[PDB]
Amino acid sequence: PNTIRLHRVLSAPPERVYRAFLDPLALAKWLPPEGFVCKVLEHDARVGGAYKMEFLAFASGQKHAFGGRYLELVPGERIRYTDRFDDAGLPGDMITTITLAPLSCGADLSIVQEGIPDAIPPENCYLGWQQSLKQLAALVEPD
Amino acid sequence: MPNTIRLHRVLSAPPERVYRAFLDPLALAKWLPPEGFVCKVLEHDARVGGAYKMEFLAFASGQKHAFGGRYLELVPGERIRYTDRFDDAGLPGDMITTITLAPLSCGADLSIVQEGIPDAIPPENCYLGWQQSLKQLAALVEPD
Amino acid sequence: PNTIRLHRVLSAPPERVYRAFLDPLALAKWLPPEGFVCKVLEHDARVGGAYKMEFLAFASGQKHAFGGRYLELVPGERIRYTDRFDDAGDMITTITLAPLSCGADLSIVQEGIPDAIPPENCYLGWQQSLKQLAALVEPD
Amino acid sequence: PNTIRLHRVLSAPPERVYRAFLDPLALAKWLPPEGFVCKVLEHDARVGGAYKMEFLAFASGQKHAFGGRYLELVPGERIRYTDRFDDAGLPGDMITTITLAPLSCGADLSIVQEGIPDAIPPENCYLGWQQSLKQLAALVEPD
């Protein structure tokens, strides 16, 4: 497996970025990469709560579902959750942890995903996150 | 002005795909709300005479704005017309927007006209909003 | 089928948008669409004055030179200039600006576009350029 | 001083990306962040060669000149140059090294900038680079 990490400085308070990661309405807009829509099936934001949604390629209809559970939640500071692909051919336990800290300009965002299957090329995960992070910024930075 | 807005864009996507983006609740929730806003679809009956309702929420403040109406006409990959009115009493006025699509070698031609914008809503504000929504629409409909 | 029309509302005062259309440092940054760079050869911004630029596809390096002359220059209100490619028709584009509470109203009309170049491709090119224009002029 | 580090995966070959860091017509387009234009004064792309340019805020016209020397240049793989802004209280210079590696999707880019005066908040540098990098991608990824 492989571990990946990203870092972004955002012009928004950490609490607002934090909410963006848990709010189903926010997630459906910023999480899916370009050309993908997202349907959120379950969003129980509690330690132990279940995560559930699926991405759909808009031009083909190709759907990919995934989900997991929230392992830890520290308001405006930390989110760690598991990810399990319901796709036929990707078993295992992928864990991502989001760390947020305040800055004068807003917030420092750290993301790390461990246990990424060797089948999934790391480069693809970075491309995917880069698109989603750009979308997250457009949503959280205003006002 | 007055109370009217007209938008034209060339999209690198088939007319049918763009058409689909204007009626699919999952697409709409992603591209329709402008920057800093999220969308929640309350009702979505995609057929002539059918009603629909949605609400926009400013993500930073939580401030909500709900609007709704009925579809007047639906021709696959060609046109869509619907009534659009706000629940806010401070924004009285029924809006009529008509979307027209046509094929092109690169993809599709899109024209949008919004009539009846409430007097309390500066038309320039609608242009700023649609310009953001249109950019998001392109990002969704143009790939692959 | 040789005339194109674009309209945009910008969050910047008219005077600043006007300057973006004439400042060579601004033009080199926003005019060339995605994947293109621009070199400004001439920029005599006076009525009767000439401007000359070249767009280069960054990946391939294919060059495209074009130029013309300014016919109208009213600070924050109007710019009109001719435009011709160094490849064998003359075009005239007119930019009109008006103040708005939120900033500026921008109208563009480009006439005489050679039938050789599909209008749809001009719209696509302008859409990319206008997005780049907004990013430069709306700040601060 | 402080050190900044950034990482991006780009859908373009390393040589084209490399080229974007040395071509004056490219730098003038992607290097200056939002609301800024770039004027290139001198651009001698070779070891020991001089580097000189200035960013101008388009709205105010406020100028910011900076320059340096190219210390290392390896086609499609590495670039190392010094950088210093023309400001009092800032006698020392910074060193930034760009490293590229191929990927099937295109290229992996790593940037490291050290020697940033403690007076300059690192977060501001990140925001600046994030904007420059998005412009870089739009330029180099096409075709």
Side-chain angles (χ1 to χ4, degrees):
Chain A
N2 298 117
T3 291
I4 274 337
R5 67 197 69 246
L6 301 106
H7 175 246
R8 294 286 186 290
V9 167
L10 297 165
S11 288
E15 178 56 54
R16 187 189 302 156
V17 179
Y18 180 78
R19 279 193 296 127
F21 274 87
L22 306 173
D23 180 336
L25 301 181
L27 290 168
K29 188 182 184 177
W30 78 265
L31 223 186
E34 300 171 2
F36 288 95
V37 291
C38 171
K39 183 175 175 58
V40 180
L41 288 62
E42 180 170 43
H43 50 83
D44 187 9
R46 295 180 295 149
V47 174
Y51 220 140
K52 258 300 174 178
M53 54 261 293
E54 62 183 307
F55 289 170
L56 291 75
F58 192 71
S60 71
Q62 185 77 172
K63 51 173 60 63
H64 271 55
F66 57 103
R69 297 172 181 292
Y70 292 111
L71 293 180
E72 299 183 54
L73 296 171
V74 181
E77 288 179 41
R78 170 183 179 80
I79 302 167
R80 187 187 285 274
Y81 59 91
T82 64
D83 187 354
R84 312 294 298 297
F85 293 66
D86 291 55
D87 171 63
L90 294 173
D93 191 6
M94 196 261 264
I95 302 168
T96 131
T97 129
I98 308 298
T99 77
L100 290 160
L103 291 174
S104 299
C105 67
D108 187 279
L109 167 60
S110 165
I111 298 169
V112 49
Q113 290 199 302
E114 320 168 72
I116 297 167
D118 301 89
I120 299 299
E123 73 184 13
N124 285 0
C125 303
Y126 279 117
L127 285 174
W129 273 109
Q130 289 171 177
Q131 286 174 39
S132 294
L133 291 172
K134 177 184 178 302
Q135 306 179 331
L136 168 59
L139 172 62
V140 73
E141 291 184 331
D143 194 299
Chain B
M1 298 103 87
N3 314 83
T4 311
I5 244 73
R6 291 176 182 281
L7 301 146
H8 171 274
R9 300 282 187 288
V10 167
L11 296 168
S12 294
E16 178 59 53
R17 192 189 293 163
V18 183
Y19 177 76
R20 209 142 57 65
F22 270 95
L23 302 168
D24 177 352
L26 300 182
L28 288 160
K30 184 178 182 180
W31 77 264
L32 197 55
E35 298 187 7
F37 285 94
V38 290
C39 175
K40 191 170 188 172
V41 179
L42 289 66
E43 298 180 57
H44 54 90
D45 190 359
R47 61 184 173 181
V48 184
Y52 75 106
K53 176 163 269 56
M54 291 174 216
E55 61 176 53
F56 277 2
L57 305 85
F59 195 73
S61 72
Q63 197 183 89
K64 185 190 294 68
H65 278 297
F67 53 96
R70 323 190 71 72
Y71 294 108
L72 286 298
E73 27 193 297
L74 305 170
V75 179
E78 297 198 2
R79 72 148 48 194
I80 300 167
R81 169 178 294 185
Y82 60 76
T83 53
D84 190 328
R85 44 180 168 288
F86 288 105
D87 292 60
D88 189 350
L91 312 182
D94 218 316
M95 289 182 280
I96 302 178
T97 78
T98 84
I99 300 295
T100 59
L101 291 170
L104 291 180
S105 305
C106 62
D109 181 283
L110 167 67
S111 295
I112 307 169
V113 51
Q114 194 171 73
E115 290 161 35
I117 301 164
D119 296 10
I121 309 300
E124 67 206 32
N125 285 11
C126 297
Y127 273 115
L128 285 172
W130 272 102
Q131 285 168 181
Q132 284 164 42
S133 309
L134 253 32
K135 293 191 177 306
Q136 305 173 176
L137 174 71
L140 170 65
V141 76
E142 291 183 342
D144 200 6
Chain C
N2 334 58
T3 290
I4 263 73
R5 299 167 182 286
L6 305 123
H7 301 66
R8 293 285 188 289
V9 165
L10 292 164
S11 285
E15 180 57 36
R16 190 188 302 155
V17 183
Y18 176 81
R19 293 191 298 109
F21 272 94
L22 304 170
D23 187 336
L25 300 183
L27 289 168
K29 188 180 188 181
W30 78 266
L31 240 201
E34 287 176 348
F36 283 91
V37 287
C38 167
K39 182 177 182 181
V40 174
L41 298 313
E42 265 179 50
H43 55 86
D44 184 5
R46 293 181 299 187
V47 172
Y51 77 89
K52 205 290 170 48
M53 305 178 263
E54 61 180 2
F55 282 171
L56 297 88
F58 197 68
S60 78
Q62 193 171 74
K63 184 183 290 67
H64 290 298
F66 59 102
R69 307 198 84 96
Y70 295 102
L71 308 180
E72 301 175 5
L73 295 175
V74 182
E77 293 175 51
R78 160 72 63 82
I79 297 167
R80 174 175 285 190
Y81 56 86
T82 62
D83 186 353
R84 176 172 63 240
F85 277 113
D86 286 2
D87 182 5
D90 210 73
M91 304 87 93
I92 292 174
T93 82
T94 90
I95 291 73
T96 64
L97 292 160
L100 292 175
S101 173
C102 65
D105 189 85
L106 170 66
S107 293
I108 304 78
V109 56
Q110 189 167 65
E111 289 185 355
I113 301 46
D115 293 288
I117 165 167
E120 65 191 59
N121 289 52
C122 291
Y123 271 112
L124 285 178
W126 273 109
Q127 287 164 182
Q128 287 167 43
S129 291
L130 290 167
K131 171 191 288 62
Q132 304 178 165
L133 171 66
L136 167 67
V137 85
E138 292 184 338
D140 282 298
Chain D
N2 297 296
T3 293
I4 241 73
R5 300 169 189 286
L6 302 120
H7 173 240
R8 295 285 187 288
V9 165
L10 299 169
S11 299
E15 178 46 44
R16 195 186 306 156
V17 179
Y18 179 79
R19 206 143 55 63
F21 274 92
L22 308 170
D23 182 346
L25 304 177
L27 291 167
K29 187 180 188 182
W30 77 266
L31 231 198
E34 305 182 7
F36 286 96
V37 294
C38 183
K39 171 65 174 299
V40 181
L41 294 305
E42 203 194 314
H43 53 80
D44 188 10
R46 64 187 175 185
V47 181
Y51 185 64
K52 227 298 183 299
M53 27 189 85
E54 67 176 59
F55 290 156
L56 290 79
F58 197 66
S60 64
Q62 174 74 296
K63 289 186 176 181
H64 295 293
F66 61 97
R69 296 260 295 293
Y70 288 111
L71 302 172
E72 185 175 357
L73 299 173
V74 181
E77 299 176 48
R78 184 191 181 76
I79 300 169
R80 179 159 158 280
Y81 58 97
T82 61
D83 195 321
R84 58 230 300 188
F85 279 108
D86 284 63
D87 306 309
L90 303 176
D93 59 58
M94 313 87 92
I95 31 292
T96 133
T97 89
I98 288 71
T99 69
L100 291 152
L103 293 180
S104 69
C105 70
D108 186 274
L109 168 64
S110 304
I111 298 166
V112 54
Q113 196 174 307
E114 44 188 300
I116 306 166
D118 285 359
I120 313 299
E123 65 201 56
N124 286 4
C125 299
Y126 276 119
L127 292 169
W129 275 104
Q130 290 173 177
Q131 290 171 29
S132 294
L133 294 178
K134 283 185 176 62
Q135 303 178 324
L136 173 69
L139 172 67
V140 72
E141 292 186 330
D143 191 300

